[PDB]
């Protein structure tokens, strides 16, 4: 009997937690591990320390067929310890379930650990506000059972379906906001159902690691001393946080890049609507997937210090390097930021606005959408 651990995430936040799990378990050099993290490359000098370490690409939010070649290397009874993105959990587990069908006598699911993609889970839940949640949960359990028995996916409520894994497997959920599940009264049946199966993402995990494990983790997440030193300057600091669009259309991507530059100018220029003051040093923390939208900022702004886009904002919180003020387009990073550090959050009944309002992240003041800002 052998456990294999799979770490799967096409996004950022689940991967950040899963890389913490790997760090906590890093003394075990031979435990089989399969990494399917789209946004993170494990350094070669770390890979070389481990045996039975494997890598799999994700395509259309699932591990490719290459997963099967890896699993075939382990011919005995295997129990899978699976770490997944909540929003994409149904797709990410699909090929795992297909493999289990083919090898029903030797392959089992030990447990699931699930982590929020980010704001999407909350915006999606907010849209379920008028439904009978208790009834939705019962139907989703039934349809999950059909998926597990047939390998076919058909959910009447794809959103609620993300939360009924306990009906089939031992599970632990790690939520960006546990407050949401208490504050949203319509979700009371879901909070009750989830019972003892969830906790908040633990941003204090890093502080509990050993000095060696702390250094290891920082290497996993792309943090380096140069970035550290940039953020240790003796001057008040403002970090402008970027966003992205998933659209490929050039007109849309160009519009996003232009509007975001205009938004930056509204924070940093004396005549801007959101003017922060002249005494701040300005940094740019671009979206990990901003691409040429990030480039547009660096090419067109001045006196701005880049923080490499691949570095998740939450690492600054972990390392004690948060700035005085943070501002930009609504992002999951705002869910874990001390409220005193928010300058302004800008949006592109709006369900995202509703989520942030429920959580006390934004106040009762009229929300600012970026198309309401004068072109400076």
Ligand X SMILES: CC(=O)N[C@@H]1[C@@H](O)[C@H](F)[C@@](OP(=O)(O)OC[C@H]2O[C@@H](n3ccc(N)nc3=O)[C@H](O)[C@@H]2O)(C(=O)O)O[C@H]1[C@H](O)[C@H](O)CO
Contact in structure between 14 and 84 (CB atoms under 8 Å): yes
Which span (129-137, 143-151, 223-231, 283-291) binds ligand X, by CB under 6 A?
Answer: 283-291
User: How many beta carbons lie within 10 A of that of residue 2, not counting itself?
Assistant: 12
Tokens of 78: 């295997």
Q: Which is nearer to ligand X, 31 or 174 (CB)?
A: 174
- Applying CB under 6 A, among 157, 166, 331, 343 the residue interacting with ligand X is 331
Q: Which of 32, 22, 111 is closest to 76 using CA atoms?
A: 32
In the complex, least distance from residue 212 CB atom to ligand X, rounded to whole angstroms? 24
Residue in 221, 205, 210 with CA at minimum distance from that of residue 27: 210
Q: Which of residues 120-159 bind ligand X (CB under 6 A)?
A: 120, 123
The verdict on 209 binding ligand X (CB under 6 A) reads no
Residue choice 32, 63, 242, 327 for contact with ligand X (CB under 6 A): 242
| Pick 54 or 162: Cβ nearer ligand X | 162
Kindly state whether residue 218 participates in binding ligand X, applying the rule CB under 6 A: no
Q: Does 117 bind ligand X (CB under 6 A)?
A: yes
Task: Choose the binding region for ligand X from 71-79, 226-234, 235-243, 295-303 (rule: CB under 6 A).
Answer: 235-243
Of 223, 220, 242, 222, residue with least CA distance to 231: 223
d(CA 4, CA 141): 26
Residue 72: Cβ within 10 Å count: 10
243 binds ligand X (CB under 6 A): yes
Using CA atoms, how far apart are residues 257 and 255, in angstroms rounded to an integer? 5
Q: Tokens for 154?
A: 């058909």
What residues contact 34, with CB distance under 8 A and at least 6 apart?
Answer: 4, 5, 6, 7, 54, 55, 56, 67, 70
Q: Minimum distance from CB of 16 to ligand X (Å)?
A: 6
By the rule CB under 6 A, 313 interacts with ligand X: yes
Identify which of residues 89 and 119 has a Cβ nearer to ligand X in the complex: 119
Residues near ligand X (CB under 6 A) are 11-13, 117-120, 123, 241-244, 285-288, 312-314, 331-333
Binding residues for CMP: 242, 285, 287, 312-314, 331-332
């Amino acid at each position: 009997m052998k456990t294999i651990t799979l770490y799967l995430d096409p996004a950022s936040l689940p991967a950040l937690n899963q890389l913490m799990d790997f760090t906590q378990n890093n003394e075990d050099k031979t435990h089989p591990r399969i990494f399917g993290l789209s946004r993170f490359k494990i350094p070669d000098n770390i890979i070389t320390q481990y045996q039975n370490i494997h890598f799999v690409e994700l395509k259309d939010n699932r591990p490719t067929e290459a997963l099967f070649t890896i699993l075939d290397q382990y011919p005995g009874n295997i129990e899978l310890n699976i770490h997944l993105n909540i929003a994409h959990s149904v797709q990410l587990i699909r090929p795992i379930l297909a493999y289990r069908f083919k090898h029903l006598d030797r392959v089992s699911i030990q447990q699931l650990n699930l982590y929020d993609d980010g704001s999407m889970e909350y915006v999606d839940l907010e849209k379920e506000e008028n439904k009978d949640i208790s009834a939705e949960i019962k139907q989703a359990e039934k349809q999950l059972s059909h998926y597990l028995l047939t390998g076919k996916i058909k959910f009447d409520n794809p959103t609620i379906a993300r939360y009924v894994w306990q009906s089939a497997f031992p599970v632990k959920y790690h939520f960006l906001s546990t407050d949401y599940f208490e504050k949203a009264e319509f979700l009371q049946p879901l909070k009750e159902y989830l019972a003892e199966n969830y906790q908040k993402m633990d941003w204090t995990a890093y502080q509990q690691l050993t000095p060696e494990q702390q250094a290891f983790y920082l290497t996993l997440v792309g943090f380096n001393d140069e970035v550290k030193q940039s953020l240790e300057v003796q001057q008040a600091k403002f970090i402008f946080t970027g966003t992205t669009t998933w659209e490929g259309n050039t007109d849309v991507r160009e519009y996003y890049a232009q509007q975001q530059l205009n938004l930056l100018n509204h924070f940093t220029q004396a005549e801007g609507d959101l003017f922060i003051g002249d005494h701040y040093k300005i940094y740019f923390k671009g979206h990990p997937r901003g691409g040429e939208i990030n480039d547009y900022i660096l090419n067109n702004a001045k006196n701005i210090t880049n923080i490499p886009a691949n570095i998740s904002f939450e690492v600054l919180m972990m390392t004690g390097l948060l700035p005085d003020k943070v501002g930009g387009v609504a992002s999951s990073l705002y869910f874990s930021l001390p409220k005193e550090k928010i300058s302004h959050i800008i949006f592109t009944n709006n369900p995202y606005v509703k989520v942030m309002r429920r959580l006390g992240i934004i106040d009762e003041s009229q929300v600012i959408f970026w198309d309401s800002l004068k072109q400076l």
